[PDB]
Amino acid sequence: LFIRREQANNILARVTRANSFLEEMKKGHLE
Amino acid sequence: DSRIGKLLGFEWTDLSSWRRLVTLLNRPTDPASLAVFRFLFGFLMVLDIPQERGLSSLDRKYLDGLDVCRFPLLDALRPLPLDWMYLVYTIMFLGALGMMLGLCYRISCVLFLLPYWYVFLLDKTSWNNHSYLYGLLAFQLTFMDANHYWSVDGLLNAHRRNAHVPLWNYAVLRGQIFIVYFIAGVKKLDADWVEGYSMEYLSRHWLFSPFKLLLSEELTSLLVVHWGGLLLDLSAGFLLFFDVSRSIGLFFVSYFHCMNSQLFSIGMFSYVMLASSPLFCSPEWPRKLVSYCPRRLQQLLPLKAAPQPSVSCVYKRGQKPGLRHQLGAAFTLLYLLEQLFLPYSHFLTQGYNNWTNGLYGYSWDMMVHSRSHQHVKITYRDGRTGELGYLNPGVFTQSRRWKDHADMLKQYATCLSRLLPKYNVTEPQIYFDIWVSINDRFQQRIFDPRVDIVQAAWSPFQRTSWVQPLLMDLSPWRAKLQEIKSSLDNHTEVVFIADFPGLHLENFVSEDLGNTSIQLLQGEVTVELVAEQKNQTLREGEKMQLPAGEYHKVYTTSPSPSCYMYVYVNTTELALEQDLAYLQELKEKVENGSETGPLPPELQPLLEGEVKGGPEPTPLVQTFLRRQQRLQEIERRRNTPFHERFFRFLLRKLYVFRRSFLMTCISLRNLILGRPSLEQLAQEVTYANLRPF
Numbered sequence: 239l240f241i242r243r244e245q246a247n248n249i250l251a252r253v254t255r256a257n258s259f260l261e262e263m264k265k266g267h268l269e
Numbered sequence: 270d271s272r273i274g275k276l277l278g279f280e281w282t283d284l285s286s287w288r289r290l291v292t293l294l295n296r297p298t299d300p301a302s303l304a305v306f307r308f309l310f311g312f313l314m315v316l317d318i319p320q321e322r323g324l325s326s327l328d329r330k331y332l333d334g335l336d337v338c339r340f341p342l343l344d345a346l347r348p349l350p351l352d353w354m355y356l357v358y359t360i361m362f363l364g365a366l367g368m369m370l371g372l373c374y375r376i377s378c379v380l381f382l383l384p385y386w387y388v389f390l391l392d393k394t395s396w397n398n399h400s401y402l403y404g405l406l407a408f409q410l411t412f413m414d415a416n417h418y419w420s421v422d423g424l425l426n427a428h429r430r431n432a433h434v435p436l437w438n439y440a441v442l443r444g445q446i447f448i449v450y451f452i453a454g455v456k457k458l459d460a461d462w463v464e465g466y467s468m469e470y471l472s473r474h475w476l477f478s479p480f481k482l483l484l485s486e487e488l489t490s491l492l493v494v495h496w497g498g499l500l501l502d503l504s505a506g507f508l509l510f511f512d513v514s515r516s517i518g519l520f521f522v523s524y525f526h527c528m529n530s531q532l533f534s535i536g537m538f539s540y541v542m543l544a545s546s547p548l549f550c551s552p553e554w555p556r557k558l559v560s561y562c563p564r565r566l567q568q569l570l571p572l573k574a575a576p577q578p579s580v581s582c583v584y585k586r587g588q589k590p591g592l593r594h595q596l597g598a599a600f601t602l603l604y605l606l607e608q609l610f611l612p613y614s615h616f617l618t619q620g621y622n623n624w625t626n627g628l629y630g631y632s633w634d635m636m637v638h639s640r641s642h643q644h645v646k647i648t649y650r651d652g653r654t655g656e657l658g659y660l661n662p663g664v665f666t667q668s669r670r671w672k673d674h675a676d677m678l679k680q681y682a683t684c685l686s687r688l689l690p691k692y693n694v695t696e697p698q699i700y701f702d703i704w705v706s707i708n709d710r711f712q713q714r715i716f717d718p719r720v721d722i723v724q725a726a727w728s729p730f731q732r733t734s735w736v737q738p739l740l741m742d743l744s745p746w747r748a749k750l751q752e753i754k755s756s757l758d759n760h761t762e763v764v765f766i767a768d769f770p771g772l773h774l775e776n777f778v779s780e781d782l783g784n785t786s787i788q789l790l791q792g793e794v795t796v797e798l799v800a801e802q803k804n805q806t807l808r809e810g811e812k813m814q815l816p817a818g819e820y821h822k823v824y825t826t827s828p829s830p831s832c833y834m835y836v837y838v839n840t841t842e843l844a845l846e847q848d849l850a851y852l853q854e855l856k857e858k859v860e861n862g863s864e865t866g867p868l869p870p871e872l873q874p875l876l877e878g879e880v881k882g883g884p885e886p887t888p889l890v891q892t893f894l895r896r897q898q899r900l901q902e903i904e905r906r907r908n909t910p911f912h913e914r915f916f917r918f919l920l921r922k923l924y925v926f927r928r929s930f931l932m933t934c935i936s937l938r939n940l941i942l943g944r945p946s947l948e949q950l951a952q953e954v955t956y957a958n959l960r961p962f
C-alpha cells in the first residue's frame with residue numbers, strides 16, 4: 239500500500255477527467 | 270358549490286374547529302388509484318433490489334475477513350456476516366412481493382421498511398435522493414389502507430373487498446410529491462444553475478437534436494435544460510393539482526421523466542415518478558377504465574360496483590370521531606411539516622456542513638454541483654521512529670465520497686489508525702491534501718494539510734475548524750478561463766490552481782512532461798527549484814520554464830490567495846504518435862504499390878499481422894497493432910443492429926437476476942442445514958457464476 243515520494247507529489251498526472259453527479263448508480267459489473 | 274371550495278375540494282368552514290378537520294381528513298374516498306400505485310411501487314422495488322441495492326454484488330462488498338473501512342451514520346452499527354445479510358435481503362424481497370400483491374399488508378410493509386432502513390443507514394456512500402424517497406413512501410404506505418382494492422387480502426377477508434379509505438392517504442402522498450417538485454425547484458435557484466454551469470455538456474445528447482434546428486447549442490444548453498427544468502419543477506408541483514391544467518401537466522411531466530430516464534442512469538426514479546403522477550387524477554380512474562371493457566374481459570379484472578362502507582372513515586348522517594381518525598390527521602400534518610423543515614435543517618447539524626450543505630441524500634438538490642478532483646495525498650509519521658511515509662490515495666475503501674465530506678474523513682483516519690499497526694507503523698499521525706473544483710472553478714484545497722486528522726476535533730453540532738473556505742471571490746474569473754482553455758492546440762493541456770497565504774505546493778513533474786511552463790494570473794508567488802536551491806519571485810503575467818524530472822515548490826507570499834496555472838505537453842506521446850503515423854504511412858505506401866523497394870524485416874510482422882516463426886515485435890509494432898485492433902473493435906461495435914443490442918441487454922439482466930437467486934439459495938442453505946465441504950462450495954459458486962447464453 240505504501241507509495242514513493244515521487245509518485246505522491248505528481249499533481250500533473252493523467253486522471254479520468256469527468257464530472258460527478260452523485261445521484262447516479264455505479265456500474266457495479268465489468269468486463 | 271362555492272367557487273373557492275370546488276377548486277380545492279373543501280369549504281373553509283371545514284377548518285373552523287378540530288372536530289371538523291378530523292371529519293375532512295377522514296372523508297370516504299374510492300381506493301382505486303391507491304391500489305394501482307401500491308402494485309406499481311411494489312413491483313418496481315422487486316425489480317430494483319437485485320440491481321441497485323446490490324444483492325448481485327453482495328458477496329464482494331461484505332466479504333468475511335477482508336478489512337475495509339465502513340462509513341455508517343452511527344459508529345455502533347456494524348454489518349452482520351454475509352449469510353445473515355442475504356437473509357435480510359430475502360426478507361426485503363418477500364416484503365416487496367407482499368406489498369405488490371397486498372397479502373398480509375401490514376406485516377409485509379414492516380418487513381420491507383426495517384431492513385431497507387438498516388441497509389440505508391449502514392453506509393453513507395450510497396445515499397441518493399431516490400433511495401430516501403423509496404424509504405419515505407414505504408413508511409407512509411405502512412399506515413395507509415391500500416389493500417382494499419385489487420388485493421389478495423380482500424379475497425381472504427370479506428370486510429376489505431372494495432372498501433372506502435380515508436382521504437388523508439391521498440393527501441399525504443400528493444403532499445410528498447409536491448414537496449419533491451417544489452423543493453427541487455427552489456433549490457435550483459442557485460447562481461450556478463440559472464447561469465448554465467451545472468449540466469453544461471448535456472446539450473450534446475442526440476435527444477436534444479430537434480431543438481438545435483431552431484436555436485444555437487449554447488441557448489439550447491441554457492434555456493431548455495436549465496430554465497426549462499426549473500420551470501417544469503415548479504409547474505409540475507402546481508399544475509397537476511387543478512383540474513383545468515392536468516392534461517398539460519401530465520404531458521410535460523411524462524416527457525420530462527422519460528428524457529431523464531434515457532439521459533441519466535438514476536435507476537427506477539423516473540418510472541416511480543411516472544407511477545406517482547396519476548395520483549393527482551380522480552380517485553376512481555381505474556374503475557371507469559375497467560367499465561369501458563368487453564364483458565368477457567371483466568371476468569378477470571377487478572370489480573366495478575360501488576365500494577362498501579368502511580369503519581376507517583367518518584360518515585355524515587352524526588358520528589363522534591374515535592381515536593384512529595385523530596391520529597391519522599395528526600400524522601398527516603406533522604409528517605408534511607417535518608418534510609418541509611428537514612431540507613432546511615442545516616443550521617443545527619453544522620458538523621456535516623462543507624462547501625455544500627449537509628450530507629447528500631435528503632435535500633432534493635439533484636444535479637446541481639459537479640466536482641472534479643486533481644490529486645489526493647495521504648502522509649503518515651510513525652510515532653516511535655519518526656519516519657515519514659506516503660500511502661495510496663484510496664486504500665481500504667470502496668467509495669470516493671470521503672474526499673468531499675469531513676465526517677467521513679475522520680472515520681477514514683480512525684480506520685487507518687486501527688489498521689496500520691499490523692504493518693509495523695506505531696501510533697501514526699495522518700495528514701490529507703485534496704484538490705477539488707466545483708462547477709469549473711480554480712482548484713483549491715478542501716482540508717488543512719497541516720492538521721493531524723487522527724487526533725483532531727469533530728462533533729456533529731459544531732463547525733469544523735480544519736475545512737478551508739471556498740474562494741467564491743474568484744467566481745467571475747471563469748469567463749476568462751474558457752478563453753484561455755479554448756486557445757490551446759490538440760496536444761497542450763492546462764491546469765488551474767488557487768492557493769491560500771502561508772501554504773505551498775510541492776510538485777514532481779514527470780520525465781515525460783517536457784516543455785512545461787508556469788504563468789501567474791493573480792497575486793504574488795515564489796517558485797523554488799530544489800536541485801540548485803534557487804527561488805525566483807514572480808509578479809503578474811510572468812512565465813517560467815520548469816524542469817522535467819525534478820521537484821519544485823511554489824510558495825504563496827501575498828496577503829490574499831494567489832491564482833496561477835500550468836501548461837504542459839506530453840513530449841513522449843507526441844514523439845510516439847509521430848513515429849506511429851510515419852509507420853502507418855509507410856504501410857499504406859507499400860499497400861498501394863508505392864515504395865517498390867523490399868520491406869524491412871521489422872515491417873514484415875505488420876503486413877503479416879501475426880508474430881509466428883520470427884523475432885518478437887518491437888514496442889512500436891505492438892502499439893500499432895494494439896491500436897489497429899482497438900479501432901477494428903470500435904468499428905464493429907458501431908456497426909451492430911438494434912436487435913442484437915436489445916438481446917444482449919436482456920441476457921445481461923437475466924444473468925444478474927440468476928446470480929442473485931443462486932447466491933441467496935446457497936446462503937440460506939448454509940444458514941439452515943450447515944456448510945458442506947470446500948469442494949462442494951467451490952463447485953456451487955462456479956455454477957452460480959455461469960453465463961446464461
Ligand SMILES: C/C(=C\Cc1c(C)c(O)c2ccccc2c1O)CCC[C@H](C)CCC[C@H](C)CCCC(C)C
Binds near residue numbers: 450498502
Ligand atoms: C436533470 C434535470 C433535473 C434533475 C431532476 C431529476 C433527474 C429528477 O428525476 C427529478 C424528479 C422529481 C423532481 C425533480 C427532479 C429533478 O430536478 C433536468 C432535465 C431537463 C429535461 C431532460 C429537458 C427537457 C425539459 C422540458 C421537459 C422541455 C419542454 C420544452 C421547452 C422548449 C419549453
Ligand SMILES: *[C@@H]1O[C@H](CO)[C@@H](O[C@@H]2O[C@H](CO)[C@@H](O)[C@H](O)[C@H]2NC(C)=O)[C@H](O)[C@H]1NC(C)=O
Binds near residue numbers: 250251779782839
Ligand atoms: C504521457 O504520455 C505517456 C505515453 O507513454 C502516457 O503513458 C501511459 O501512461 C500510463 C499511466 O502512467 C502508463 O501505465 C502507460 O504505460 C503509458 N503508456 C505507454 C508507456 O505507452 C502518460 O499517461 C502521459 N501522461 C503523463 C502525465 O505521463
Ligand SMILES: *[C@@H]1O[C@H](CO)[C@@H](O[C@@H]2O[C@H](CO)[C@@H](O)[C@H](O)[C@H]2NC(C)=O)[C@H](O)[C@H]1NC(C)=O
Binds near residue numbers: 795
Ligand atoms: C526560497 O524562498 C522560500 C520562501 O520564503 C524560503 O522559505 C521559507 O523558508 C524559511 C527558511 O527555512 C522558513 O523559515 C520559512 O518559514 C519559509 N516560508 C514559508 C512561507 O513557509 C526558502 O528558504 C528560500 N530558499 C533559498 C534557498 O533561499
